């Protein structure tokens, strides 16, 4: 869809027997990262990770650096509080993750806001879709919920998500127009790997596409085959494009019985293709 | 309870370390330190939120340090105090985006020298019989004079009970020698009663001035009595005359 | 940063509504309008706040225009206790704007109702029999202005409003004194503070 999203991802990892936790933040527009912050650096600062964000003046970088530093010390507070809620000891390392941001439509208007938290990898507490209420995972999360409700944090978050989030996302989308409004279709092709004197592997490749969302399907005689198929996770090529492939094991001949189907944005119509041998 | 601040008054010689303490309202997660002077009015010194210092751009670049060790205690410290640090320092707190509420403040006068501190003299001026004849009311006037610095609280006591009805005290003391840096202060107050109440010689009127000065534990080498925090009163009995 | 502007001073009659205006043309959508007031040697006192809708409470009512570019604090029935400096402050919903930044404010003076003015200047003697005295200008109407003296040896207090509950009676007053030998109550405030129909015993 012609929609867009912006997302920040915070990871705080406590360090027992030592000092401040490690705090890292990254920001994405859709599947394109554009900023980062790492408390471990010598003098930590928000840093650009995309061309179209370097245009921002130093007020931007100073403000965001200060935001990340304050968040890091606060996350330290949150980590020792949560350790208290669960009666865990001082010896272990623990992780607090935050992810938040906004999905907007082609019109630039807001479709959905998000702000949720995980503790040691598990859903801890999340702002509901109405941007006015919370869903807690357990009773500890309800301690946190009473704190967030008393401080009316949901209204602050709704202000940010309906305000700065969408406005700055529209600014980013306009400034990185070429790189963010693009949809690179996948360059696609099928390969053949004989594993026996009758068995073989039929692998369908999608390379160089953007964004990461894609669906590959194997169809035996034009009929959904999902049996002894291998489907690897979508993976980054490192040049801001993505790669994926799916494989099916196939007996003797009858390779032409099988078809791979590729659904992706940048494609005008879905793609059907078979092993074209030589 | 509200925001708790201490000390309410501090009169101290320059060169000392000054510590002001604040307890936010229970459960409030944001805390602000503000300074108020004549020149600039109220000015934010520092803003903490969830124990983390968010904005300290207003802090003086030297001698001033603010701390929030736990969610229910904060300090402002002035390492060597100087007379220009004299001001009222307010602590405020808030619960999230609810209203910010202010404490009653710490009034700090950093003094060039303790020998400059003087308690007030107090005098009660009896009603004019011209006023009594013309209005059947009688106004007493209390005058506190010659004190420095200007930390005084005046109150009226009739027959041993503190009164509020019919009192007007000047909101600020005036300077007795307005040009000189030597200047003491003066303060006036009025208590107006019925002529029949004043004419009863059984009625006793006392003007009381609470003065904040030196601590009893301050050094003192002068001949005159140590000008410590103290009350000075003047009195008058009613007169059928 | 301060975004509000107010008239530096304003006068109001006791028992009448006080309409205190405030401009904030650059206010943002995530920014509330707060009103605080400060008496004398007291900490600022929250009055009221609002976003878009007009608001009321025990103390005041707050009217925010449709375009949010200005507002009015309304004290529906001013009392003497309402004399104070009134601050209109914008407060945003994030950390950049969560603190209050105080501007000039509006010095509001609530003038008492003096039904029967009886302006007079009286001499008061020290009770201790020191032959010292003060001068008291009193019972004048609230539209009288007491100016200070240009002589650093003559002390003249600001006007002070006294509420005598024993008779449900209010009166203005000012006190003057001076060691100057030519100082007398006849001339204490004659400094164009008093109209000719003042009573001089």
């Amino acid at each position: 869809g012609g929609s867009h999203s912006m997302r920040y991802f915070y990871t705080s990892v406590s360090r027992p027997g030592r000092g401040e936790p490690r705090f890292i933040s990254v920001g994405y527009v859709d599947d394109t990262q554009f900023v980062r912050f790492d408390s471990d650096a010598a003098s930590p600062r928000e840093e650009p990770r995309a061309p179209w964000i370097e245009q921002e003046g130093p007020e931007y970088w100073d403000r965001n650096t200060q935001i990340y530093k304050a968040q890091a010390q606060t996350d330290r507070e949150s980590l020792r509080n949560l350790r208290g809620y669960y009666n865990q000891s001082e010896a272990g390392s623990h992780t607090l993750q935050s992810m938040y941001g906004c999905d907007v439509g082609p019109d630039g208007r807001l479709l959905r806001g998000h702000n949720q938290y995980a503790y040691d990898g598990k859903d801890y507490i999340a702002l509901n879709e109405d941007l006015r209420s919370w869903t807690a995972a357990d009773t500890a999360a309800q301690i946190s919920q009473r704190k967030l409700e008393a401080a009316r944090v949901a209204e602050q978050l709704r202000a940010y998500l309906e305000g700065e989030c969408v406005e700055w996302l529209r600014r980013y989308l306009e400034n990185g127009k070429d790189k963010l409004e693009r949809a690179d279709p996948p360059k696609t092709h099928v390969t053949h790997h004989p594993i026996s004197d009758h068995e073989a592997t039929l692998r369908c490749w999608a390379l160089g596409f953007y964004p990461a969302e894609i669906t590959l399907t194997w169809q035996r005689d034009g009929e959904d085959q999902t049996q002894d198929t291998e489907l690897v996770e979508t993976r980054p090529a490192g040049d801001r494009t993505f790669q994926k492939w799916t494989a099916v094991v196939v007996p003797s001949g009858e390779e032409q019985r099988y078809t791979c189907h590729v659904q992706h944005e940048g494609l005008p119509k879905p793609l059907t293709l078979r092993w074209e041998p030589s | 309870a509200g925001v708790i601040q201490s000390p309410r008054h501090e009169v101290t010689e320059m060169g000392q370390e000054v510590t002001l303490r604040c307890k936010p309202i229970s459960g409030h997660n944001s805390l602000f330190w503000y300074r108020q002077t004549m020149m600039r009015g109220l000015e934010l010194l520092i803003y903490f939120n969830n124990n983390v210092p968010i904005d300290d751009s207003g802090m003086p670049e030297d001698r001033f340090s603010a701390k929030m060790p736990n969610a229910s205690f904060s300090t402002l410290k002035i390492q060597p105090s100087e007379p220009r640090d004299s001001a009222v320092y307010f602590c405020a707190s808030s619960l999230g985006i609810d209203a910010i509420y202010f404490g009653e403040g710490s009034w700090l006068t950093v003094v060039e020298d303790l020998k400059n501190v003087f308690p007030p003299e107090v005098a009660v001026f009896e009603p004019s019989e011209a006023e009594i004849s013309h209005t059947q009311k009688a106004t007493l006037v209390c005058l506190a004079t010659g004190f420095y610095p200007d930390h005084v609280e005046l109150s009226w006591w009739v027959n041993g009970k503190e009164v509020h009805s019919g009192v007007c005290t000047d909101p600020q003391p005036l300077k007795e020698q307005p040009a000189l840096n030597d200047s003491r202060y003066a303060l006036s107050s009025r208590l107006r009663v019925s002529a029949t109440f004043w004419q009863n010689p059984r009625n006793h009127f006392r003007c009381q001035v609470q003065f904040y000065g030196l601590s009893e534990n301050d050094e003192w080498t002068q001949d005159r009595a140590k000008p410590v925090t103290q009350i000075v009163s003047a009195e008058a009995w009613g007169r059928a005359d | 940063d301060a975004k509000t502007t107010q008239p530096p001073s304003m006068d109001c009659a006791e028992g009448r509504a006080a309409n205190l205006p405030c401009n904030h043309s650059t206010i943002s959508g995530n920014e509330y309008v707060y009103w605080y007031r400060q008496i004398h040697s007291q900490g600022p006192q929250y009055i009221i706040h609002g976003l878009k809708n007009n608001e009321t409470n025990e103390m005041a009512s707050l009217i925010i225009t449709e375009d949010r570019k200005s507002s009015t604090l309304i004290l529906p029935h001013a009392t003497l206790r309402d004399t104070a400096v009134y601050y209109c402050i914008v407060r945003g919903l994030n950390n950049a704007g969560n603190m209050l930044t105080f501007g000039g404010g509006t010095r509001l003076m609530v003038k008492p109702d003096i039904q029967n003015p009886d302006p007079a200047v009286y001499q008061l003697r020290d009770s201790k029999s020191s032959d010292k005295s003060v001068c008291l200008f009193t019972d004048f109407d609230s539209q009288t202005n007491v100016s200070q003296s240009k002589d650093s040896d003559v002390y003249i207090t600001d006007k002070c409003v006294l509420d005598m509950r024993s008779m449900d009676f209010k009166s203005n007053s000012a006190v003057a004194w001076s060691n100057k030998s030519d100082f007398a109550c006849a001339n204490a405030f004659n400094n164009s503070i008093i109209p000719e129909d003042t009573f001089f015993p």
Binding site: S25, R63, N81, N115, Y117, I125, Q156 | - | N95, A96
Partner: peptide, 9 residues
């Protein structure tokens, strides 16, 4: 731009 908040749990 990141949220100008330091929420605590």
């Amino acid at each position: 731009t990141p949220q100008d908040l330091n929420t605590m749990l």
